């Protein structure tokens, strides 16, 4: 039979059968209970709208993501999300399909063990396998080397790989991602008068960020230009009218990636953690990693980031090496495409964690040889 390539993510759940080009169903991972009282009788009001249904009734819900930073903080809601994904968005019972979840690097063990225990006890799948979210993104590019920066919505991690041999001592995981950029944008919009507070209006700020923000090639020059002319002010229409005008908030929101001091984080930007991740590698594979830097994940879709990052790394790196940044147009679904490719391989067909194996060793089987 065919395998189910699910990809929990944090912000958008992407799923679909193995062997295709794009995920079949992509929908936000939010579960929102209603918060008001409700007076109409017999309206058929449910107790929790999940997935894309709660992005249409969000006016009277309190949306809450079940995955904070890669890790899962609310297991009941995550179980509800998985149940919805299997039964309503794909309509395939899990009793007859292997599953291939994905997990960020350096995550707590208990999260992974609970994930496999749920998949084997509640949904009762035949066999499931957990894979690191960066190796898949490297599969999708058709490479076999390269250092991949997978800046998702929950957590940004940077896994270097050479000739198929991952370097476990050079993984640099940073917890700045799309959600913190949304919060920072929502916080700097208040400098013009627009106040978004409700958890429903966070979605509106996210839409503003997606449609308007861009990464500046040079930050100081843009700050000077936006403060003199008015060629940058782009307007946007809220879900009820009252258009708003975003000035130099456009390139200040995604600039947080390269200067995490804006949101008070100490660490260095995504332009310098990649160079540090490279320098921890051996001295003989640094040229190949320099030449095959891969971008993935949703948050790396800002217009103009593949040039800013290349300029920064070229500034840091030695002058002789060639710096090349692979930015495929299908960046958002790169991890899932790689997952489909991996699940479609014949050599991989014996790596699944078969159910009888789980019955013999318990949920701690995932840390064992079947990784």
């Amino acid at each position: 039979t065919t395998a189910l390539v699910c990809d929990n993510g944090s912000g958008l759940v992407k799923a679909g059968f193995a062997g295709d080009d794009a995920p079949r169903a992509v929908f936000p991972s939010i579960v929102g209970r209603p918060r008001h009282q409700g007076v109409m009788v017999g309206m058929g009001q449910k107790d929790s709208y999940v997935g894309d249904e709660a992005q249409s009734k969000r006016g009277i819900l309190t949306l809450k993501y079940p995955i904070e930073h890669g890790i899962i903080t609310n297991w009941d809601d995550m179980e509800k999300i998985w149940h919805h994904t299997f039964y309503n968005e794909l309509r395939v019972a899990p009793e007859e399909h292997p599953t291939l979840l994905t997990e960020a690097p350096l995550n707590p063990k208990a999260n992974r063990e609970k994930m496999t225990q749920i998949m084997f006890e509640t949904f009762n799948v035949p066999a499931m396998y957990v894979a690191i979210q960066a190796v898949l993104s490297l599969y999708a590019s058709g490479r076999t080397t390269g250092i991949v920066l997978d800046s998702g919505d929950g957590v940004t991690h940077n896994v270097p790989i050479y000739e198929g041999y991952a370097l476990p001592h050079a993984i640099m995981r940073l917890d700045l991602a799309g959600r913190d950029l949304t919060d920072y944008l929502m916080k700097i919009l208040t400098e013009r008068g627009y106040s978004f507070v409700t958890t429903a209006e966070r979605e509106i700020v996210r839409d503003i960020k997606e449609k308007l923000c861009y990464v500046a090639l040079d930050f100081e020059n843009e700050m000077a230009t936006a403060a003199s002319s008015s060629s940058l002010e782009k307007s946007y229409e809220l879900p009820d009218g009252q258009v708003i005008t975003i000035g130099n908030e456009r390139f200040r929101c995604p600039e947080t990636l390269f200067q995490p001091s804006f949101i008070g984080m100490e660490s260095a930007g995504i332009h310098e953690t990649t160079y540090n991740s490279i320098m921890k590698c051996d001295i003989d594979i640094r040229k190949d990693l320099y030449a095959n830097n891969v971008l993935s994940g949703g948050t790396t879709m800002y217009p103009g980031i593949a040039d800013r990052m290349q300029k920064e790394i070229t500034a840091l790196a030695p002058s002789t090496m060639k710096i090349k940044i692979i930015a495929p147009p299908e960046r958002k679904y790169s991890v899932w495409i790689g997952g489909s490719i991996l699940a479609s391989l014949s050599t991989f067909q014996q790596m699944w964690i078969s159910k009888q194996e789980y019955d013999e060793a318990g949920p701690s089987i995932v840390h064992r040889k079947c990784f």
Partner: protein
């Protein structure tokens, strides 16, 4: 110990052709076909239908004027 992947045979970077070159031409041609058929179905039919509705609207206007005038003629007392 870290997992040990059993040794296989092949391949990689050879499916990039079979997943890229396909849509490099088929997708472009199919989308061009879709745009052509949608424009043909939509624009000319919409303009013709709007002209037809405009003519019917003018006829309704004439009927309204005639009825209003005759009723005002009779009722004027």
């Amino acid at each position: 110990v870290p997992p040990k992947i059993p040794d296989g045979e092949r391949v990689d970077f050879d499916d990039i052709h079979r997943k890229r070159v396909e849509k490099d031409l088929n997708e472009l041609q199919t989308l061009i076909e879709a745009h052509f058929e949608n424009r043909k179905k939509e624009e000319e039919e919409l303009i013709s239908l709007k002209d037809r509705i405009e003519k019917r609207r003018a006829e309704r206007a004439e009927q309204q004027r005639i009825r209003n005038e005759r009723e005002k003629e009779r009722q004027n007392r």
